[PDB]
A paper describes a structure:
The enzymes of the fumarate respiration are anchored in the inner mitochondrial membrane where complex I (NADH-rhodoquinone reductase) acts as a proton pump that is driven by the oxidation of NADH to NAD+ and coupled to the reduction of rhodoquinone (RQ) to rhodoquinol (RQH2), while complex II, serving as a RQH2-fumarate reductase (QFR), transfers electrons from RQH2 to fumarate. In contrast, mammalian complex II catalyzes the reverse reaction in mammalian mitochondria, where it acts as succinate-ubiquinone reductase (SQR) in the aerobic respiratory chain. Since fumarate respiration is the major pathway of energy metabolism during adaptation to a hypoxic environment for many species of parasites including adult A. suum and bacteria inhabiting anaerobic environments as well as some human cancer cells exposed to low nutrition and low oxygen conditions, the pathway is one of the most promising targets of chemotherapy for both parasitic diseases and cancer. In spite of the similarity in amino acid sequences and three-dimensional structures between A. suum QFR and porcine SQR, flutolanil specifically inhibits the enzymatic action of A. suum QFR.
Flutolanil (N-[3-(isopropyloxy)phenyl]-2-(trifluoromethyl)benzamide), a commercially available fungicide, is made up of two aromatic trifluoromethylbenzene and isopropoxybenzene rings that are connected by a peptide bond linker. This compound is a potent inhibitor for A. suum QFR (IC50 = 0.058 μM) but poorly inhibits porcine SQR (IC50 = 45.9 μM). To obtain insight into its high specificity and potency against A. suum QFR, the X-ray structures of A. suum QFR and porcine SQR in complex with flutolanil were determined at approximately 2.9 and 3.0 Å resolution, respectively. The determined structures indicate that in each enzyme, flutolanil is bound to the quinone binding site via hydrogen bonds with three conserved residues (A. suum QFR: Trp 197B, Arg 76C, Tyr 107D; porcine SQR: Trp 173B, Arg 46C, Tyr 91D), and there are 13 residues within a distance of 4.0 Å from the bound flutolanil, most of which are conserved in the amino acid sequences of both enzymes. In the porcine SQR-flutolanil complex, like A. suum QFR, the trifluoromethylbenzene ring is surrounded by a similar set of residues (Pro 169B, Ser 170B, Trp 173B, His 216B, Ser 42C, Arg 46C, Asp 90D, Tyr 91D) and the η1-nitrogen atom of the guanidino group of Arg 46C donates a hydrogen bond to the trifluoromethyl substituent with a distance of 3.2 Å. However IC50 values of the derivatives 1 and 2 are comparable with that of flutolanil. This is probably due to the unfavorable arrangement of the guanidino group and the benzene ring for the electrostatic interaction. In fact they poorly overlap with each other and are separated by more than 3.7 Å.
Numbering used by the authors:
A (entry chain D): 35 to 136
B (entry chain C): 6 to 143
C (entry chain A): 10 to 622
D (entry chain B): 9 to 247
The structure:
Amino acid sequence: SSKAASLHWTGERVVSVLLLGLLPAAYLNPCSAMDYSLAAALTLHGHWGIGQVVTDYVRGDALQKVAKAGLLALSAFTFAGLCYFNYHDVGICKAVAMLWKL
Amino acid sequence: TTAKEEMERFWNKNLGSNRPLSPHITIYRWSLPMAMSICHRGTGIALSAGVSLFGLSALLLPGNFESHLELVKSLCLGPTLIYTAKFGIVFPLMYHTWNGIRHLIWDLGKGLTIPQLTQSGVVVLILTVLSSVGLAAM
Amino acid sequence: STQYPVVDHEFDAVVVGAGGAGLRAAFGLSEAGFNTACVTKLFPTRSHTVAAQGGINAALGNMEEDNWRWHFYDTVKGSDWLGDQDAIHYMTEQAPASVVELENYGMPFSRTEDGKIYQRAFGGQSLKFGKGGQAHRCCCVADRTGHSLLHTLYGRSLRYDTSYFVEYFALDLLMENGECRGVIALCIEDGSIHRIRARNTVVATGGYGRTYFSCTSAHTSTGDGTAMVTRAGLPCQDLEFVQFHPTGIYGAGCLITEGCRGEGGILINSQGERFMERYAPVAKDLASRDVVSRSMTLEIREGRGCGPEKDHVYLQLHHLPPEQLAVRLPGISETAMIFAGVDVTKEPIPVLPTVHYNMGGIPTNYKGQVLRHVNGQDQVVPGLYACGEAACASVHGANRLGANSLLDLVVFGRACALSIAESCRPGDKVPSIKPNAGEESVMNLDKLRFANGTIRTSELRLSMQKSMQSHAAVFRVGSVLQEGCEKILRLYGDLQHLKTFDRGMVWNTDLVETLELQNLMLCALQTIYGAEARKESRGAHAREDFKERVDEYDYSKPIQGQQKKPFQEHWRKHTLSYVDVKTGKVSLEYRPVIDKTLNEADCATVPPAIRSY
Amino acid sequence: PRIKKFAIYRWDPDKTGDKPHMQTYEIDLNNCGPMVLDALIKIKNEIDSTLTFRRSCREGICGSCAMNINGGNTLACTRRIDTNLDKVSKIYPLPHMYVIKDLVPDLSNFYAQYKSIEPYLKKKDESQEGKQQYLQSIEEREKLDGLYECILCACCSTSCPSYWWNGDKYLGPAVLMQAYRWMIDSRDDFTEERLAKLQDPFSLYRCHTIMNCTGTCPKGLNPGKAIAEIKKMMATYKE
Ligand SMILES: Cc1cc2nc3c(=O)[nH]c(=O)nc-3n(C[C@H](O)[C@H](O)[C@H](O)COP(=O)(O)OP(=O)(O)OC[C@H]3O[C@@H](n4cnc5c(N)ncnc54)[C@H](O)[C@@H]3O)c2cc1C
Ligand code: HEM
Ligand SMILES: CC(C)Oc1cccc(NC(=O)c2ccccc2C(F)(F)F)c1
Ligand code: SF4
Ligand code: F3S
Ligand code: FES
């Protein structure tokens, strides 16, 4: 059938190096664009990550349903609030930057 | 009798019985790679909680970032105590970040022996402390 | 009956044992399409064949030109003409195919530049009928070929509907009017008793080296199937013949294989000299196994012996290329180090002759069918087979040839399977069984379970071991032997006194380690009494009072003009021992060996001769 | 004389409402072999014979006696007793397994899982089998080295926190390394379909590279490393 399990494991790795790539690249080159991908990478990576924490510890079809749902909400909400902050406020690069000289 | 059935029968027999489960966490020697595996969750999790709070506070709360900074400037901040909260944040990001690379290397198959584990383990711990102390004073 | 819950099962075939033979027979039967139970007191992989290091003989001719008929000659020459040449033919011929099937099952043999199974030199094996030098026909998986044999056999057995009664202790056969109906077994796990009945019952319980103090065999090698046969009133052939493998570590009694000698390695005494060149000029250290331990043991009496207390001889590996102990001998590199604190690559190894293999066992056809002795002739027992160390078609006679027992397993294991395939169909009416049947195995179970006596199972066992050690050793005489016999017959009496403590149902190691002891005495009774009756030196049985190999002629002098000796005045015959269950009373008898091969045209009988290696 | 303390796990299932506890025993090391199992067999024979455990080969090559000695899974018959009399040896059964009794854990699942990966040669044309020896080059054979000596002691799998919390559905390192053994067998023709069977969250993918498994293997083998090789194969087999 589908080789789904191996793709997801590969997806995971990819964004992890993409995300490894952006922490340097957003010190060197802050901007709207970096801010959005740093959001897209941060949130995707962490969502899959907790994914694994969830599939490890959360036993039963009962709870593993809710947890994977509630998670996905939190993920989406989080990606949207980061995007909001990038649009209508400072944006993560400059926000971190400001936070630091303080 | 097939493998799937064997497994099925293993579970019904043992669950409905007076059989004690052997100890584990309470008995098992702590090895650096196992403590460094656990930390890699904690950090990952703690970090994701931070990012999510930063996303959710951007939506559910009012005031902009400068507004919030001004509020967070005017608590008569202690110059060391800033470094604390700062270093307390750069720490997990660095530990997890370095160890992250360690993993990816393993994913490629490089570095999977007890010697190399305990070397890399240390090299992370160091790098962390360097980059953590480093950045907290940038 | 009412105290112990009894479950009844019904199959086409039961196999007691899951070593090389057990598995091979059990899975072969299953493949042949037989609903087949395999009772084994251990997880099949923990069976003893695992510990086999050396290899598996088959004239494949990967290393040179070879002929299985030369391997025949070698084996019968190794049997000291106690070997039945019909079975030896059957084996040596069927061995190429038997090994190739193992390679084809996924067994990861070591390889040549040709891509073919790698073979090596091994104890006392020739080309061109004993005149063509040392021969290389020992197939192997580096130093762990038993391990790999046993796992690839276990692995493949899962591919069929083989019913694995794992950790079930067989107690006795289910005989009825001379025919075997199956086995009755304890289920170590839940304490209950099971009666597994089939049309055909195959005994592959392996050896009983645990009758002695020092032995290479594992704690589970306790003659259980040999004993059940004895408890059925059936004979046990040749139990006197006990191979003292020459290289077994001082303390632990752990084997460092004969493949260490087959790879150029030497046996050294305490005065520098390779003491094996004087004793056997032709073959040297790579000579027969009764001869090499006889030499090592005969060196120690003099005081040529080495070490802290002058009682153990040195194996030497150090010179070979340090390369060659990485590829061909990794298993003994580790475990000679672990149990001796010895670096095999720079230090010679501390060894000593200890018990190793039992060429005695349950008497058998070349077909695997178990024989009784009726009016001085052979009679197949219906529905009952055996194979492996447990059995005795005596393809090994008075001395097993190095690397033939693993071959044995695979060949005869497969033979029993085949004999049943050939002679009956799956489904065929599984014969009835008295409701009282098995009653006494349980009664015995229960009395041992609650035994409140004076002597402890461990201490009683330890008396037997050091007795069989100090009386049934490498060298022996009628005086020592007889004292041993009455000494060991006393101990069988002592069994009524014995003390168990643990009184539970679930995993009663005490209760079974004692059931095991019962079994061990029966094997030792028959081993020692038989040995004191045998008034000659053939094979690994070496009497100081009868240093002479007693045949039906004098085969040193040319044959004609000799007056042939009558059956009851020459020792070239199989010992058949019995024992009265209730008095420990050994009666014994004899049946002639077999010399006709399966076909003169194809493989021509090798008549007895002088036996210098 | 040099007496040594031996804190051992015990639980009788035949003793109504008994619950896991530790006994101590006491052994003169002058009157004992160097390995822990020697001490175990000694107390078994000379003191308490209710003490129960698995053992056969005492050679470190059958896998019977695997158990938790001083917090680490090894074969008792090959681990040597701490001659420092000041410490007290702690023997437990293997971790997070159902005790049948005393030191004996129920490994049916362990074996069941082994069975499930079909640890045997599979060829596409088996019409020819038993009749000719298959060609495998000395290079092809080297790829099996370090994989085939697995003794199935269950030290590794049962030292894996993933197996601890997901051993019903996570195969664990012992079994996985064997699947790898049959994957990289040149002679085997089902490598793809063997990989396919691992496509799901649990079978392979609970491995989070913790590496207790390789760290505890009493035979020097590297199951963790094999898990990684599979994952790489898994990420890259076509069809
Ligand atoms: C250290 C060592 C190295 C050796 N090396 C070699 C070698 O290199 N080459 C070679 O050819 N030979 C070698 N041998 C000899 C050979 O390996 C054995 O003779 C052979 O392994 C026996 O196979 P088997 O199946 O008959 O018995 P085993 O392998 O002992 O199997 C016995 C089976 O019977 C079962 N059993 C026993 N009692 C009961 C009971 N009451 N109820 C149910 N089941 C029971 C056990 O569970 C087990 O499954 C070696 C022996 C030793 C000790
Ligand atoms: C360059 C930066 C980073 C790298 C290279 C990286 C790498 C990794 C890798 C490889 C894993 C999987 C390890 C495994 O279990 O096999 C992982 C897990 C995880 N990471 Fe990251 N990471 C980074 C930053 C972050 C950040 C910023 C967050 C959150 C804000 C985060 C959250 C997580 C979480 C939640 C997990 C799952 C924890 C687990 O499975 O145990 N990571 N990380
Ligand atoms: C005895 C201590 C050191 O041992 C423990 C105890 C509890 C949890 C764990 N560690 C995990 O639980 C863990 C950690 C990181 C990644 C995956 C896991 C996993 F697989 F889910 F099990 C280890
Ligand atoms: S791998 Fe090492 S530990 Fe895991 S089972 Fe095979 S041997 Fe025991
Ligand atoms: S101990 Fe466990 S998580 Fe993975 S690599 Fe090793 S199996
Ligand atoms: S008992 Fe065989 S491995 Fe220790």
